[PDB]
């Protein structure tokens, strides 16, 4: 069926999913863009409703897998979309309720722990790098919204691709100690170069937000503190960039490379 | 004390117009925002024409003026001129510098980054911060790429002032590399060598195209080796600035004693 009026009750409800409070109440979230819908489906997330605009391809309709397919008019589409140039494919997926307690880590895991909230767009970039390097788990700050239009768009759907859990600092500390994982803190003044850590047997990298840096409690908790060399005028890199360097160094060692 | 209070003051409007590249071209001037960015421009020998100080500037911020005109801005006048939600309290209007590629001398085994095409100012800025961090000897960017936008300056943390970055033409870039006798390493998603497998101990020019388009086939023919960043999940691409940082720090790893994979 099709819905024409932007004022239709179903459309208003779809547009309301732009707000975190409405997503948490209804248990649904909107995924905008063909690429992002593909990743949410490939990740096995439960599609409830597929929204198709006027210029969608025929292959787009076959993505529904039996879910409701609602064709929306451009006027209706404009209201639902979080974009200047709305996408022709959108999906309403069920919001997953997941607990860090349900997590069991495979062999020699690569874990990234982000402490504190970081500038917008940093998380999306980090998830892309984490997805690329094959990270097994990413812990983020307790207040992080993993289902916002922003994180979905900035991660290009990589947010769906891996286990990401927003947790309080104390929950993170407890989980890591339970897992008996060596903690490696990335700090500007770390005693060792980050190439020199041994990441072949599994590791949790500790990474702080630019505003405050790593709390001293976490620096002390680390088995090793490591640094990224800065040989120029700049004294630090963006936290997302630091994350990518660490992850790909750990992947380099898992691919046959030796610690420096 | 020369004070500007109203966002309606024509000078404030003119200062705010410097955000646009056309205005920078016409005036031959650009705005540098931030005490640390201003000091860096000054350390790099750039010419300061006008120092801007907000209501919360330090007393010693005045000691940066040299011979420049000093303008004290109200809080709301500062908000109009600034490119940030939380404006800096020290800003400087400098003369656009003239960069000559001829005076660049490279030693043996230099680390070079060649950025073909364009993307956003945020991306270029972050690439320059990584080049500064990794100690690149030279960065070449596409021909009409803007090195002195507020974004580039902010995202580079002012590293754009002391870093050897040059706007250059595709053919000029190609010839210069040929003149320098540097092996070209093209970073592409299709390359059949992981980037850790290249040997960057003796010098290298990395070739990086925009994430959207890619790399022109004329440049793909000039590459000695083609390398990729490995991608272990569904995505096969990362932001271009992230790829640049990964390549540069892999060369630095090898230069610090690490061996190619």
Residue numbers in the entry:
A (entry chain A): 1 to 260
B (entry chain B): 0 to 260
From the paper:
The A-loop of the 23S ribosomal RNA is a critical region of the ribosome involved in stabilizing the CCA-end of A-site-bound transfer RNA. Here, we report the identification of a third system involved in Um2552 formation, consisting of a methyltransferase of the SPOUT (SpoU-TrmD) superfamily encoded by the ttc1712 open reading frame of Thermus thermophilus, herein renamed RlmR. The RlmR overall structure consists of N-terminal (1–96) and C-terminal (∼105–260) domains (NTD and CTD) joined by a linker.
However, the deposited structures contain either methylthioadenosine (MTA) or adenosine (ADN), two SAM degradation products, bound to the active site of the enzyme. Therefore, the study of the structure of the T. thermophilus HB27 enzyme in the absence of any SAM derivative was undertaken. The structure of the enzyme from HB27 and HB8 differs by only three amino acids, and apart from the slightly different orientation of the L30-like domain (see below), both proteins are identical (Root mean square deviations are 0.690 and 1.472 Å for TTHA0275-MTA and TTHA0275-ADN, respectively). The enzyme crystallizes as a dimer, the asymmetric unit consisting of two dimers. Dimerization involves around 1535 Å2 interface consisting of CTD α-helices α7 and α13 of both protomers, organized perpendicularly. The dimeric state, confirmed by gel filtration chromatography, and the perpendicular interface organization observed for RlmR are hallmarks of SPOUT enzymes acting on the ribose, in contrast to the parallel dimerization mode adopted by SPOUT enzymes acting on the base. Except for a slight movement of P188 side chain to allow a CH-π interaction with the adenine, no major active site difference was observed between the T. thermophilus HB27 apoenzyme and TTHA0275 in complex with MTA or ADN. In the absence of RNA, the structures of RlmR apoenzyme (this study), TTHA0275-MTA and TTHA0275-ADN show several different orientations of L30-like domains relative to the SPOUT domains.
